[PDB]
Swiss-Prot record, chains A, B:
This is Alkaline phosphatase. Its EC number is 3.1.3.1. GO terms for biological process: protein dephosphorylation. The keyword Magnesium applies.
Length: 449, 449
């Protein structure tokens, strides 16, 4: 018997050149929004993060993949929407730092405490705070952590690791850069070792590389981290076939999927933007990445599999899904990569909403940790940074610009950005909120203490 | 019947360095939102437009003027929020043009038809369509049109003029650039002449210059447009004292306030951003413009006066208020200018919300026509365009970047941006919508046609 509505179609409803033809609405929305509002408990939460997916990125991806008056059946379909702030803190002064990195922002929603750029799961005093995943597990809920990034990267790592620098992937980086955290120094360990201790029911991503490192101390000293996971009873999987053979995931047999050495394959290929690229180079049509095939699960497939396995828990589950970006160095300023990454997340969102609509007790939240610096500019633009012309689904040219930095490691900005939600307690993302409110929203929705 | 709530305080609630200290919420919002929803008639609408005020521009201005965890008591206080799209059309092909100007966007919300960049109140076939203001007047509602721009500029002009180019300020430019529209060539006339025909009850802004031109045909041939307004029964005012003297405004004595030759004075002064300006030049503290004083009404003052005069109409009123930017040219890339303009709008929004909350039947909408290209970047950023360090209310440095254009005429981007609303029918701004939906929202809320 009918659940809360997901937005079915907010594409332009007609001929965009005619009066009323670009409308996305067909009538009054007051009843629809009423029907979207419930304060019943959330049994499950699915949190989907698009790396750099601020409003500009969503718009550009829509323009390219769906056309300007098109509609992302995942990303655009959430009925309750707001804007949230994600400033970090200066470690020394405690004053706002207007432009966060991925680590401080993931720390904020996962713990409810602001922190300094580069911190995971700790505050500006380097004190550990519990994460929403740890708390969900302690309350008897199943837990999932899914990303197309290496699993040691900030977004997934923040759910399961407490370290003073996001660089602390394995034992060697930790001994050097976070000596207070190093296992041999009485610390909780590297990000990978702490992930293994956290023992979520389902962990799926890239990052096999670090598992080749050996532990410096503890029960599994001298064993590779892969050997340690094996010894501690994880089901290790490495491709789509081995993932699909998994029939259950729980504390006795926790699932750890390592699908790439570093990050998983980008969906779409295209050239790096160049100086006056929209003027001096032909318009670009993105191409499918050959590395992307049925042997490597997609974000949407990993999401579906996680939902399948976690939904067996009768108490409920918490799942985080990250559509990560490979957006630095040779890979910075790549519209095709960045748009394809958003399309990937859209598919995963559709899987999440399809489940949530049927199940009826699931809160789905879709946002970004911080926004990419890409801008949509006029077709004839002469811009001082990097630009590219693209052939969109509309059969028109869109130009994207990257003008925030002359170096190719600063890819994000301080702008507040869209947060959207569906299901019980979704009212809590509407209007202006802070990224730290997201922690408290999730905590309260699941009834965690 | 209590009042539908306005958000009283969504500043960070505590010590931003402590767990929960950066939360903007104190508890669950489901009840507040259920209390925010009504589809009863709107007696009045107040639409506030911030020129270029996308999410980035709101964040930058909040950061500077209120601190990162601060709160705009007007702009941030509307409980129902979404994101809307404002692409224009290529005139020849009818395909989307991903980056609109102020004319095509204003046409979109004022008529509900998409159009080409530079068009006012006409579609891609140069056919006139009625505006929300014209419709409100035809239904017996009082009408107001307030802007800190020249009143001939695109945003206020779109409510009252139908011309093939926004350049068509007066007879001279119209005869040259829009000959089909020129009065002596058989058209409805220049923007200014059509403004005089439209006869809103209250029109307040800049743009006295064009009123010195003389008409080329018609009953008032050879008279200046100022003399024409006098002959047609307008009350003309030119400063704060004359505006204060006004006791009523209606169809017998419509009010026309012309408070500057061109645009009204900018609130705050500061230097233009420069190449590597955050590195090479001191952090900037904005200063008050001497030209802003009690003899020139502020945006908030013009808003309050318009509300007082328009609210006498028992049937209801439609009022548009624009916080205009200047922006081009010598004036492009000016953080202090653009932030001060946003602070100006926030004050006007507070006046609109204070009225709306007490009146109970007033829909207040706050958005932008399109977003400025400014970006908030890391303090040590080396950017290829124009940059500036600013000393914020937090006692920390924020860097703004302008990296979209090597010229000083393109100042806006294609990103979807925040739309927020309060009062009856405010549900219709939540989720993804189009700028043309806003026309239909206003039309339906007021029961027009
Ligand atoms: Mg990430
Ligand atoms: Mg304007």
């Amino acid at each position: 018997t009918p659940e809360m509505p997901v937005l079915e179609n907010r594409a332009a409803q007609g001929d965009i050149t005619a009066p009323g033809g670009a409308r996305r609405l067909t009538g009054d929305q007051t009843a629809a929004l009423r029907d979207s509002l419930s304060d019943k408990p959330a049994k499950n939460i699915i949190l989907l993060i698009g790396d750099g997916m601020g409003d500009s990125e969503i718009t550009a991806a829509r323009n390219y993949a769906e056309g300007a008056g098109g509609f992302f059946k995942g990303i655009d379909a959430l009925p309750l929407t707001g804007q949230y702030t994600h400033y970090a803190l200066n470690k020394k002064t405690g004053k706002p730092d207007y432009v966060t990195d991925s680590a401080a922002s993931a720390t904020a929603w996962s713990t409810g405490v602001k922190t300094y750029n580069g911190a995971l799961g700790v505050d500006i005093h380097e004190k550990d705070h519990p994460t929403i995943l740890e708390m969900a597990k302690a309350a008897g809920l199943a837990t999932g952590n899914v990303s197309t990034a290496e699993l040691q990267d900030a977004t997934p790592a923040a759910l399961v690791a407490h370290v003073t620098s996001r660089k602390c992937y394995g034992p060697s980086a930790t001994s050097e850069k976070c000596p207070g955290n190093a296992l041999e120094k009485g610390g909780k360990g590297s990000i990978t070792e702490q992930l293994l201790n956290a023992r979520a029911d389902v962990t799926l991503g890239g990052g096999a590389k670090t598992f080749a490192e050996t532990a410096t101390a503890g029960e599994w000293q001298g064993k590779t981290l892969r050997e340690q996971a094996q010894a501690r009873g994880y089901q290790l999987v490495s491709d789509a076939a081995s993932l699909n053979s998994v029939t259950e995931a729980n504390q006795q047999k926790p699932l750890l999927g390592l699908f790439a050495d570093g990050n998983m394959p980008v969906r779409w290929l295209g050239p790096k933007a160049t100086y006056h690229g929209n003027i001096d180079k032909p318009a670009v049509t993105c191409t499918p990445n050959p590395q992307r095939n049925d042997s490597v699960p997609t974000l949407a497939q990993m999401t579906d599999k996680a939902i399948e396995l976690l939904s067996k828990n009768e108490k409920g589950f918490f799942l985080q899904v990250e559509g990560a970006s490979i957006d630095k160095q040779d890979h910075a300023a790549n519209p095709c990569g960045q748009i394809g990454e958003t399309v990937d997340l859209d598919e995963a969102v559709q899987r999440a909403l399809e489940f949530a609509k049927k199940e009826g007790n699931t809160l789905v939240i879709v946002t970004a940790d911080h926004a990419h610096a890409s801008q949509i500019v006029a077709p004839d633009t002469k811009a001082p940074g990097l630009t590219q012309a693209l052939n969109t689904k509309d059969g028109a040219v869109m130009v994207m610009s990257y003008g925030n930095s002359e170096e190719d490691s600063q890819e994000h900005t301080g702008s507040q950005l869209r947060i959207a939600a569906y299901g019980p307690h979704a009212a809590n993302v509407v209007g202006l909120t802070d990224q730290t409110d997201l922690f408290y929203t999730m905590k309260a929705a699941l009834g965690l203490k």
